[PDB]
Every structure is written in C-alpha cells, then in structure tokens.
Symmetry: D2
C-alpha cells in the first residue's frame, strides 16, 4: 500500500509574527490552508494513507481541519513531534505507520505545480530499490541544497548551499523511499533527511526526478514567498479556471469519492467560489 | 479614559476552508495577523485600554499572540462571545470593562488607511454627546449599509443595502460612542445598526467622512484578503513605511521607548519586520 | 495549399485613452512583448507562416518597423491598411489576393490565448475541410459577450450578441478558421444594422449551412480581450506570473520559430543579440543550449 | 519678469526594454492608465512650472506632439526640440539655451516617477533657493547600484559617486534637478567626461565644488521608480493602479493638477473628459469637478 508522511510542525520563525499563534501549515495560500498543497501532492501520487506529524499545540487544529480524511477517501493519522529538529526522525516516529511498505515524505511548506507531476511520481513509486528525490531547476543553486546527477538519473553529489554549485538543481521537499529507509533512520546518528539521502546515493540507489520548465515550486516560509504563492494560485485559478491542490476535486477525479459526497462537502463552502466550483465540477 | 472593543470572533464562513481551523482575525494580511490592523487603528486614536471579544476556541490564540499588550504600553483584556450573532451584545459583555467611560468599537476584519485618519478620530473622541460612525465613499452603495447625512455631519437615514441608495457612503466597522450606549444595549439579535439608528433618532449621531485619500477593506472573502495583502505589501515596499505596525505606533506615540522596541525586534530579526523596527529606532 | 492567417491590428482603442492616443493598442506591452506578439504566436502555433497584418494608416509602418517581413522568424509577413473604421469582415475583401485559393484564419490583434492543448485544437480546425471553426471560451457572464450555443457534434446552433437570456456559457473569441468560401461570402455580404460587414454575419451564414464547428476552450485555457486599462494590467501580470513561476515564455515568437524549426540555433543567437540587456535575450540563449 | 521653467528628457533608446521599445518610445509606454511622460510632466506642474521644453528623438518627437499638443489645454506652454546626440544629457542646457533665457530651470528625466504628499513643499524650497542647485535624493537599501550623494546636515552635497563600491551614503540621486541660470553657462563651458559626452553628474559636481549644491531628501513616505526595465515597468503600473483603486485618487493626472492649481476651469475639464468618457479616467475628471 502507498504511504506518505507530511512534516507539518516547526516554528515558522521567519514568519513571525503571523506564526506566533498559527501554525505555518495552517496559513492560507489564497483560499486553502497551506497543508492542502502537500496533501494534494500525495493524493496525486495515489497515496491515500498519510501520517501527519505536527507540534503538540497545533496537531489538534490539523485534526479539527482534516478529521481522519475519510471524507476524501483517505486515512489520515497523526503524531506529535518530540524534537524541535531532526527531520529524519519522521521514519522513527512512523515506524509502525510505515510497517513493511514503501513511504513518501513531503514537507508541509512545499507547493508543487505541474501538469506532468503525477507521471513523475508514478515513476518514483514504481522504482523498487532505493529512493527518488525531487529536483528543481533554479537560477541560484548556491542558495539551496544542490544535487549533481547522472544521465541515468542517479545522484552523484549532495551539497548544502555550495559555494561552487555542482549543478543548477535544488533538492525539493518531496522524497520517495523504499522500506529500507526506516532501517537507515533507526541506525543513523540531529538526524537529517540529507544524511539519509547521501546514504542511498552512496549505494547508487538514489534517483533524481527532474522538474524543468513547466513546473512551479515554492518553499512558503517567508512573508514574501507566502504572498507570491497566494498570488500565483489566485492567478492560475482565475485565468485558467481550474483549482490547484483542491483535495475534494482530486478525490473526486481519482474516484476516492462520488458526486454525492462532493455535493455534501460543497455545502459548507457554498458561500464562496470554492463551494460553487465543486458544484460545477460535478455536473 | 479612552476605551475600545475589538470584535474578533465569528465563523468566517466565506473564507472556508482557510477559516476552518484558523480564526479569520489571525489570518495574515501580508506580514501581520489581521487583528494588528483594527488594533493599530484604536492605538492611533490614543486608545490604550482594549477589550478583545472572540470565540471560545480562538480566544486563547489571541492571548498567545498579544498577551496583555503591556509590551506595547497597552492593557488588553479578553472575553468570549456567548452568542453567534448580536454584535451590539458587545456593550453588554463589556459593561464592566466600559464602566463610566466612552467607548469605541471596531470590527476585527476592518482595515483602515489614511494619513488624516487620527485627526478624524480625535474629533469623534472629543464630541461629547452621542456617537460618530465612519463612512466611506463607494461606487456601489447598494452593496453595504448606507448612511445619508446632513451638512452638519448628522445622520438622517440608515439603510441596509438600499435598492434606492440615499447616498454613496457606506458605514464602516468603526464607531465611537458616549457612555449612554451601554444603556441602549441593555434596553434593546441586538444589532449595531439598531443602536446607531437610536442615536440618529435623537440627533446625536455624527458621521466621519472618509473621502479620497482613504482606503478601507472588509477582509472577509478570498479575493479581498489577497487584495488587502497586496495593498499593504505595495505601500510598504514602495513608500518605505509600515501600515498598522503596533510596535512602531507604540514607539512614535511614546507608549514605549527605543529599548523596549529593540527587545521586541529580537524575535523578528529573521525578516524585514524586525529590521524595520531597528532602522526606525535610529 | 498553404496555411494563411490574417491579423486585425488597427482600430482606435478609445477605451484605452489616453495611452492609445499616440500608440496603437496592438503595440502596447503585455509584460515584455508588444501586444501583437500574442495573436502572432497563436497563428505560428497553428503552423501558419504566411500572415497578413491589417492596420491603420499611421501605425502600419510602426508594425513594419517592429516586425519587418517576418523572415527573421521563418515567416512571410505582408501588410495592408484598413480603409474603413469598421466592418471587420472587410478583411477577407482586403486580402482576397493574399488569400488566393487557400483556407484562411483570422485573429483579432487584442486577443491573448493560452493553453497547453491549444495547438491540438487548432490542428483540428485546420484539418476540417468544409466550413469554419469558431473558438469558444467558458465564461461566468455570457451576457457580456457574443454567445454561441452548440451541438454535441460541435456544430453551432445559435449566435447571440450579449443575449439577455444567454443560450450558453460560451463566449465567441477572436480566433476563427475558414475555408476558401469565406472570401466569397464577404464579397457577397451586405452591411448589418450598423452599416458594415460583420464577422458575426459571416459566422452565422456558415452555421445556417451547418458548416460551423465550435472549438471549446475549457478549464486549462486562459483568454483575454486586452482593451481596457484593467484588463491590460491583468494580462501583463498573468504573463509575468506564468513566466516567472514556471520558467517558460508565453507567445515568444523566436522560441516558437525555433521549436517548430522555422529557424535554427544560429538565427536565434543573432536575434538574441539586441535583447541581451534583459532576460528576454538571456532566455533565448539558455533555450538553444 | 522671472518665470518657472523645466525641461523633460524624453528620448533615448530604451534598449533594456526591447522588444517593446523597438517601435514605441519608452516615455510613451503606459504606466497603468497614462503614458509614462504624464508622470515627470505632472511633477513639473506640481512645482508650478508651466513652461516646459520636451526633448526627444527625431522619430518620436511628433508622437509626443500628437499626444500633448502645445499643452495649452492644460494651461501650459509646451515646446519641443530634437536630440542631436545619443548621449550627453547635460547637452539639454545647450539645446535649450534659448528656451531658458535668463530664468532658472528644472530638469527631469522622462522615465522618473515621483510620488509623495509632501513633494511640492520640497520643490517649492528648491525653486526658492537662489544660488546654486538642488538635487533630489532617495533613500535606498542598495546605494551601490545608483549614483550616490553624501551630504551635510545643512543639506549641502559633499561627494558624488557613480555606483560606489564603498557607498558614502544611502541616498541615490534621482532624475529631478533644480538649477539657477548659471547652469547654461556651465554646460556651454563643459567638456566631455571619460565617455565623450557632457554629463549631468559633471554639472552637479561643479555646483558642489562651489558649495552651491543642496540636497532635497525624499525619505519614508516617498516613492520613486526608474521605469526602464520590464520588471520595474510592471511594478510601477501595479503601484499606480493599487494607489488609485484603494485610495480613490489619481497619481500624476495632468488634467486634475491643472484644475486644482487653477490653470484651467471646470468647463475646460469637462471638454477634456469627453474623449475619456469610455473609461474611468474620464469619469473621474467629472466626479472631480462636482
Ligand atoms: N520538529 C518538526 N516536526 C515536524 N515538522 C517540522 C519540524 N520542524 C520543521 N518542520 C516542518 C516545517 C516546514 O514545513 C518543513 C521545513 O521546515 P522550515 O521550512 O525550516 O520551517 P520552520 O518551521 O523550521 O521555519 P523557520 O526556519 O523559520 O523555523 O518542515
Ligand atoms: N459572535 C461574534 N462575536 C465576536 N465577534 C464576531 C461575532 N460574529 C462576527 N464577529 C466579527 C467577525 C468580523 O470581524 C466582524 C463582522 O462579521 P463578518 O464580517 O460577517 O464575519 P463572519 O465571521 O461573520 O463571516 P461569515 O459571513 O460570517 O463569512 O465581527
Ligand atoms: N478598422 C479596423 N481595421 C483593422 N483592425 C481593427 C479595426 N477596428 C478594430 N480593429 C482591431 C482592434 C482589436 O484588436 C480588434 C477588435 O476591436 P476592439 O477590441 O473594439 O478595439 P478598438 O480599437 O475597436 O477599441 P475601442 O472599442 O476602445 O475602440 O480588431
Ligand atoms: N539622447 C537623449 N536625448 C533625450 N533624452 C534622452 C537621451 N538619452 C536618454 N534620454 C532619456 C531617457 C530616460 O528617460 C532618461 C535616462 O535615460 P535611460 O534611463 O538610460 O534610458 P535609455 O533610453 O538610455 O535606456 P537604455 O539604457 O536601456 O538605453 O533620459
Ligand atoms: Mg528551520
Ligand atoms: Mg522552508
Ligand atoms: Mg456574518
Ligand atoms: Mg465582513
Ligand atoms: Mg470597437
Ligand atoms: Mg476588445
Ligand atoms: Mg542609457
Ligand atoms: Mg533608467
């Protein structure tokens, strides 16, 4: 079974004061809570069993918002982060959730857009040994974590903010692992996502999914990039008449739910265009 | 003493799903929680004693954000809304807070901008009998609650979404009352509009006019939220000033000194908000 | 036979005063390109390389200054001055000779089309062999545009200018495909109620003969009629946003000419020369290599 | 018999703006709902300058004439002259020696957009200053990018540096300048810089070396744009549209300025609003006059 984990805690200090009483991942990107975006991304890869890891104060808010996800044909489960850092700790926290299956991990503040994205993810899910990281062409590689890679798609170096960037590809917050990752994390010595990836690479089992022209990616963690993301979503939706990362639309079009369940869900949203969109969609 | 009340609850249903787990008044307008804006507006009128009324679930979040406001030279107090509606119920809820003083009321989703706004508010505070509502020129009066008024500034009719608008002035969510309002509310769901019509019927209702130069947003829809955010971002970036920055207001009105500002700028030093406060104090 | 197109790039742009008092509307920038780059790319994307541009007497030479004969892009551009303030169907009369025996497309100079699948739509309309294909766009306010109500076959059944009782939510956009019989219609047409030969008149005729198809632009497609101050700035912002966030140029003729093999990487490099002081030139260079 | 004069530099190639400036002068491009040149033009009007020389290229000068006429419609006197050289901006004072006569002169660049409630007070001060020149400076976060002026507490310039690696100040020199009549003389007796041409910067350094160069300071509250790139063009348009829409006022609307400063009456406004009645510009002018 396809599983995913969403990292949806943290402090959001760069967003103070708006993240002082509101989790970053609950902030609106246009007309949806931020977390709808990484969540839709998992849904588009056919992942219906998802663990959401958040802080002690805000975990119940996510539960208030998302329930158990059964309304969308999903199974959402929740777990509280024990440590401020050590993101690879996710695989330890969710060892049980993961069981014997392969797992995807996506960061709560990551916004992915692209017609061909699901094809990219289906390939990563199908790969059977190792891991697939997702890389995005940037003009300023020096600013992100940088992956230099093979023509096969195999990673050859991983460098955090390299002064001499080996490539123009930034590593995004979307990752695909086989089951051996839980094992790595347990036997790792704060535990970093980067360490885990370097391991797969050292074994040659690390692939790189390339997001080139046509793709958009935002790490929504600063006042500026939040408002850029909101505007980007608002513009795309208004000009091209489609919703971006609308979980009800995705659940419906992938047959997780029927037109009736959609109508009931559109009820509470009927005072705005979100509800009315869902209705036009089902007929 | 100058008192104010902020209505910061409600359901924000037009904003679903973003208001499903986050109070509307905690949503960001650019780089500040929405409530910073109505709160600054009160500060600019010299109001330092403010009651914040919110829902049971979100009231603690506002307290987490704002504390008791002592950091800004304010005295913030909190109270939970008992009824889904009946906004005039504010004066009943805060009867004790208000005591014998005059009171201002501002809605949590109202964003006011204008160089001359404080002059307008100083006049409304100084008026001694009755009430001052704040009106904003709009191209579509039929949309809002409309106030038709005298050349004296005295209201002569109040009409909710009139099909035949008597005027182009919409009533905004900023109101100034004398102490007699608590009394009206007790003896009156209880509407802010009813209360205003009473003052008007007694001739004691003035109208503060916000014409060209002023901006006003009721941030209650996805479209207007993003319009507001963009407006704030644009003004701040192009003209180098912050809109409704409580730390800046507290400092420039001498509620706090340069030191308290520096300590407050600490947590915000990872972005331009903190850095602004620092350039400001020197 | 050869694919031909005509761009209507004149008019007064009165809604845009005062910015169109000394500048043709179609030369105004939508972000980083003159407006006319957009309908012009749209034709290129349908593989149309022979294009007639019809403009006003004062501004026709400015278009020529900007575009030359289009040979730099593997095109053949030709120009003709509009004789009458109105009567858009007069295009087919003006270009009777340009058109010769071929089929023709017509696009309005202020129309901005965007959509991944747009070329497939247009290839279909080009291949249809009798009649005409109009292009329709789902709107929320049909009452505001000219409205086409249509069959499940794709055949138009009514055409209504700003209907009070809209028969459909589909607005007719300014992109049309005709077979050669259109020149004939236009020559034998007589003015509407406003004294002039209309594109709309021509379109119903085809519909009355059952030979009028409707290309449907649904979700995924964007369309702007850039003719008011507000819409001009919405269009500019839309282009800037797409280009910046997704790393691609919209309606960049040099990119289109290159990717459809009208021109090689060398011609691109020479064309990128004059634009090397901004991102437009630098984009063209990254594209080649 | 002293009169306020200004000169607008409104030629140039706009090469950073290719391809949109290939057949359209940069200064005729729209910033929201007005041709770019409306903005520097309004700026001069707000300083009470009603006699203005517009210098442009040979091909585009007639387009400015088509747009603006002789400015009599706005209570102005507009005159035109064609730039002889691609560069040498100080050549403006030579080209307009006759226009200027014995009067003081202001110079504003065609692509410069100034906004600020208090801007006219600033400019009235500069016009009143009687010996020397006033340059207009704008606080930036990246002084290294512009021409930088370091100055006195008196307001007297003490150094001028083009894109200093070690910026002596955070104040960029904008394209708005006020001169006394002695400037025509400087320009005639000036010799090319290291790039072959008479510079505005050379002229200013001279005033400064004589101590007669003041600095008008535009701090918080003020906006300034040098609209010469695709990005900045669209930022300026957006800024104007936002201010106008949110605050209900027009920015650099010459008909409004002519009317409020009494260059023209409510009737002339109504006739001018006629052609613009199909959009909000016309309709604004009408609401304004009543
Ligand atoms: N301890 C944690 N448990 C769960 N999720 C976390 C934790 N720390 C961070 N996250 C989430 C928040 C983001 O969506 C993502 C990457 O973190 P980051 O983008 O640095 O946000 P942050 O909350 O760390 O911001 P800041 O750097 O301003 O603290 O991981
Ligand atoms: N019962 C209440 N207690 C306190 N504040 C309230 C209450 N109801 C509404 N408010 C606040 C929220 C707004 O800032 C303001 C006006 O309400 P409104 O703008 O209708 O928001 P809302 O939360 O009612 O939105 P919905 O129509 O209601 O989308 O008063
Ligand atoms: N006589 C003409 N010859 C060639 N092209 C024309 C003519 N009239 C208009 N056009 C162009 C301009 C537009 O791109 C398109 C549709 O015209 P329209 O959108 O009404 O612009 P316009 O110039 O007529 O604007 P306005 O209504 O403000 O005058 O056809
Ligand atoms: N020879 C000239 N005669 C009159 N005006 C000029 C001349 N050269 C430039 N200008 C104007 C255009 C601008 O508004 C202003 C400053 O020039 P600048 O901003 O460099 O534009 P430009 O046209 O030189 O752009 P580019 O650097 O892209 O050529 O002076
Ligand atoms: Mg962090
Ligand atoms: Mg981040
Ligand atoms: Mg309500
Ligand atoms: Mg509201
Ligand atoms: Mg027309
Ligand atoms: Mg049009
Ligand atoms: Mg230059
Ligand atoms: Mg410049």
């Amino acid at each position: 079974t396809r599983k995913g984990i969403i990292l949806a805690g943290g402090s959001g200090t760069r967003l103070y004061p708006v993240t002082m009483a509101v989790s970053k991942q609950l902030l609106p990107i246009y007309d949806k809570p931020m977390i709808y975006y990484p969540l839709s991304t998992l849904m588009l890869a056919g992942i219906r069993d998802i663990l959401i890891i958040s802080t002690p104060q805000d975990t119940p808010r996510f539960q208030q918002l998302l329930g158990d996800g059964s309304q969308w044909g999903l199974n959402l489960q929740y777990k509280v982060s024990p440590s401020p850092d050590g993101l690879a700790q996710a695989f330890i926290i969710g060892e049980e959730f993961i069981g014997h299956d392969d797992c995807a991990l996506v960061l709560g503040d990551n916004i992915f857009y692209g017609h061909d994205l699901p094809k990219l993810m289906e390939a990563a899910v199908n790969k059977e040994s190792g891991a697939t990281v997702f890389a995005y062409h940037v003009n300023d590689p020096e600013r992100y974590g940088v992956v230099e890679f093979d023509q096969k798609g195999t990673a050859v170096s991983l460098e955090e903010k390299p002064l001499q960037p080996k490539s123009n590809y930034a590593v995004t917050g979307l990752y695909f692992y086989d089951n051996s990752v839980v094992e790595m994390a347990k036997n790792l010595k704060e535990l970093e996502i980067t360490d885990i990836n370097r391991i797969y690479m050292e074994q040659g089992r690390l692939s790189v999914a390339m997001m080139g022209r046509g793709y958009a990616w935002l790490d929504t963690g600063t006042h500026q990039s939040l408002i850029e993301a909101s505007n980007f979503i608002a513009t795309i939706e208004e000009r091209q008449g489609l919703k971006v990362s609308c979980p009800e639309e995705i659940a419906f079009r992938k047959n997780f739910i029927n037109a009736q369940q959609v109508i009931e869900l559109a009820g509470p949203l009927s005072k705005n265009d979100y509800g009315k969109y869902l209705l036009k969609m089902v007929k």
